[PDB]
Design brief:
- The structure is a homodimer of 420-residue chains.
- Chain A is built from 10 helices and 18 strands.
- Chain A has 420 residues and is α+β, with helices and mostly antiparallel strands.
- Chain A has 3 domains: 169 residues, Nitric Oxide Synthase, Chain A, domain 1 (Alpha-Beta Complex); 103 residues, Nitric Oxide Synthase,Heme Domain, Chain A, domain 2; 89 residues, Nitric Oxide Synthase, Chain A, domain 3 (Bovine Endothelial Nitric Oxide Synthase Heme Domain, Chain: A,domain 3, Alpha-Beta Complex), CATH 3.90.1230.10.
- In chain A, the strands form 7 sheets. A 4-stranded mixed beta sheet of chain A has the order 3-4-15-12, sandwiched between helices.
- In chain A, strand 13 and strand 14 form a beta hairpin.
- The longest helix of chain A has 19 residues.
- Chain A is globular, with a radius of gyration of 23 Å.
- The structure holds protoporphyrin IX containing FE (2 copies), ligand H2B (2 copies), N-omega-hydroxy-L-arginine (HAR) (2 copies) and zinc ion.
- One ligand H2B sits at the interface of chains B and A.
- Chains A, B: It is found in: Cytoplasm, Cytosol.
- Chains A, B: It comes from Mus musculus.
Chain lengths: 420, 420
Amino acid sequence: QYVRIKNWGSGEILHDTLHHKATSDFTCKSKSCLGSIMNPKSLTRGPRDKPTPLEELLPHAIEFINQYYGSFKEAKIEEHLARLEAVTKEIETTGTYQLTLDELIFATKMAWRNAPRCIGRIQWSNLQVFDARNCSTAQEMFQHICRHILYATNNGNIRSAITVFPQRSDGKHDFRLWNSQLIRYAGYQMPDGTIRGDAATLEFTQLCIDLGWKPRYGRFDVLPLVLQADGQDPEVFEIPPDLVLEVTMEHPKYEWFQELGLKWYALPAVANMLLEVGGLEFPACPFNGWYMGTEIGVRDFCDTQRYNILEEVGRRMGLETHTLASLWKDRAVTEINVAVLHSFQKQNVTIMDHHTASESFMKHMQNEYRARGGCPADWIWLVPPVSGSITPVFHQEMLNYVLSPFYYYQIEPWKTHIWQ
Amino acid sequence: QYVRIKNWGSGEILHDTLHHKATSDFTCKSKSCLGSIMNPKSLTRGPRDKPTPLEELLPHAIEFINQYYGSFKEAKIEEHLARLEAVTKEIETTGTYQLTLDELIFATKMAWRNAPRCIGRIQWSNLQVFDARNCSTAQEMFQHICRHILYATNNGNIRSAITVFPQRSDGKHDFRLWNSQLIRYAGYQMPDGTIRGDAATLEFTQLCIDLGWKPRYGRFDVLPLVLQADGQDPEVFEIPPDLVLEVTMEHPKYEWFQELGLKWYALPAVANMLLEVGGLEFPACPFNGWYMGTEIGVRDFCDTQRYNILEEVGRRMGLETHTLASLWKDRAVTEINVAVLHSFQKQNVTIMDHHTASESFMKHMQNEYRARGGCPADWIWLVPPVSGSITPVFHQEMLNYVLSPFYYYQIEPWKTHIWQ
Ligand code: HEM
Ligand code: HEM
Ligand SMILES: C[C@H](O)[C@H](O)[C@H]1CNC2=NC(N)=NC(=O)C2=N1
Ligand SMILES: C[C@H](O)[C@H](O)[C@H]1CNC2=NC(N)=NC(=O)C2=N1
Ligand SMILES: N=C(NO)NCCC[C@H](N)C(=O)O
Ligand SMILES: N=C(NO)NCCC[C@H](N)C(=O)O
Ligand SMILES: [Zn+2]
């Protein structure tokens, strides 16, 4: 009937009905839970060689139209009926169909609403949609991407936005951004055995090199857009520095902090995901909301596989660096987080601390259960990388499932690409 | 064939073969992940009215004996064969069977090894086993429990231990400890609308009252053992104060910290779980290892549903208590954690910080994959309530599954008890 969910903090109880509408199989099995897996197939939508089977497309298309029309307060029945007819007619005449701008907007918001790994979902109804469904060249993609970066940025006062490129036709003409995110730093395997910049973008930095990119050998070298249009070989495009807004890090107390020469871009823009809606798939639809301090302060700066600044941030604080039990890492990371927050707040760049975000998400959950009887949620991703139980989301039991529309991962393009 | 697992910190990859031996269905479904659920049925072993069906018992029994005998370096084949025969003969003659002390020891260690929610598992081969399988009265249980508390405590130098009471016969003669843990503080719904002590033990404190316990109305009132033997009504037994070792909290800097009048018992002893092994079940088998600072500092002291000391610990630190973004909670909790650590370390009471534990568990995982091709792990429980990504376990993908022997939860006794 429904799954009983409890919040161990408030004692409140919710009943999940929404999970019943879940698509197909998920990450876990009958005798195992694999909720810990980063990139499971259930969260991935791969390549294709042929168009989508009509028998599969049609039902999916009708389901979406019924969802879309059952959305407004006083349902426009005559239009609802008319759209169902027009979409079917389009499918049997063209082998596919086009969404109305309105439906796209609904789709991108609902897919965001359906992102189980996003804590910012209370903002789901505030999203700018850029319709680049008529794009055809790499140069045009690059232009659309620039307009996105410029709009989203809004000179620090971040605005959530997404740009949709042409939907996958037969799978051999896919528009793809080879970048992880719109703005990302390079990583170099320097001569002295070390690694400069962002070690996460190592393999991709080389790819950019092999494609003729000019390695600036540094720590914060904004990588170039690697765009593939209409299935052609990817073209390298350098991002105009004027567009890339960064925030130099400075502690409100430790004046020695800026001597680290640390900064980070103000724009969190996922670039390699796929939007699935009503049987259609858009393999190129970069999007962004705003940052949560912990992503930068904790993950980007402190991960062993990323910048790895903990060792020296502890030293410069005078902490017992060679004694784990002293909890130095705990003291450092906290200061790096207030620095990140402080910095953004000083330079007027929108940001959100993990505590405030968790509280708003909790309110979002409540609004959601009351509204549609559920909220797909991935606890492992929703709970901040620090201050776990200090956060309200930690004490909230949740169900994780894939609905539709949805935002899927994709197989890295260089692994499946055709080199002509 | 096997599930591929990766550690995003080191880049290392492991192959899980162990999950194939998993018992039955787990928490999650085919289209949903419920790994976030605290007390799912898959982790619970309920009551019974009749003995265990022979057809079920026998295979389980044989599987365990084969596991046990396939354990020593140079297998004692003749004895292996002989035990298989003797156990079958015992099952068909008595309707059940008894484990040898050796098998019990192996069973309790393996079950611990199989606890997916325990980060301390590198210590799995160091465990004292108290055989109280011949116990028959509530008074005898109480005595055994006292000997356990005394041994485990060892005057601060904690030793892992478990005491096994009589196995479930027909299910109407169960030995059960109604307490959550051996040592636990009372919670009172005081006159002025507040709540004193440990709010988690509220409903149970009243139960103790209804049974004639003398409410001492305080904050750290060690609750009484509520023991049910041979299926009879539970008898109240007050724990001898001399046995209950506590640690008064004091910060190595903030001398005003002890003015809070804070302390906590040094003995983490789970009292209400059930041991399942070779088809048998022991519904009474309290156990303990040692504490991880975060359990006390973060959960016990800082949870909204527990002590809830954050508000004033922040105040006394001078932090911006009415501004979430200031990250005060982060600064406070860290100090409470070093206090807890410091205190235990000063009073010579064994304890472990979350960073050191995570590193040892990681080593345990490695030893385990190489040894038996896997390690059941619940990421959601294994990752500390603070410092998530600062910890190595956060970056380690893991599989969660139920093996055998195992430690199961049970339905709270007062909900199913027969009152004669
Ligand atoms: C309004 C501000 C928003 C905030 C603060 C926010 C915050 C976050 C955070 C903390 C994550 C985790 C990132 C990581 O750990 O790598 C995340 C993930 C995600 N967010 Fe949001 N988000 C916001 C807006 C959006 C928007 C506009 C969309 C899409 C329309 C979105 C889609 C997603 C998706 C699909 C993921 C998963 C990414 C992945 O799996 O790698 N978010 N978001
Ligand atoms: C040697 C020191 C040990 C340490 C530091 C350790 C630590 C921990 C921690 C942090 C938890 C989580 C507790 C909570 O969040 O409520 C836990 C859970 C658990 N541990 Fe260990 N442990 C140790 C020894 C043992 C032993 C001796 C056993 C059993 C023989 C054991 C069995 C378990 C089980 C089954 C759980 C799950 C409890 C539950 O689900 O509520 N541990 N342990
Ligand atoms: C192994 C484990 O799945 C990864 O380390 C996780 C855990 N949870 C996470 N949560 C979030 N928000 N981002 C992550 O990258 C992330 N990675
Ligand atoms: C809702 C969620 O399952 C609970 O808040 C969790 C999460 N992880 C946890 N981890 C540990 N170690 N102990 C817990 O009680 C705990 N509870
Ligand atoms: N807040 C968002 N989206 O709105 N984050 C998207 C992923 C960004 C990534 N975690 C980073 O730190 O770069
Ligand atoms: N470390 C252990 N076991 O060895 N903990 C068991 C649970 C104790 C519980 N988390 C508490 O803080 O009281
Ligand atoms: Zn699962």
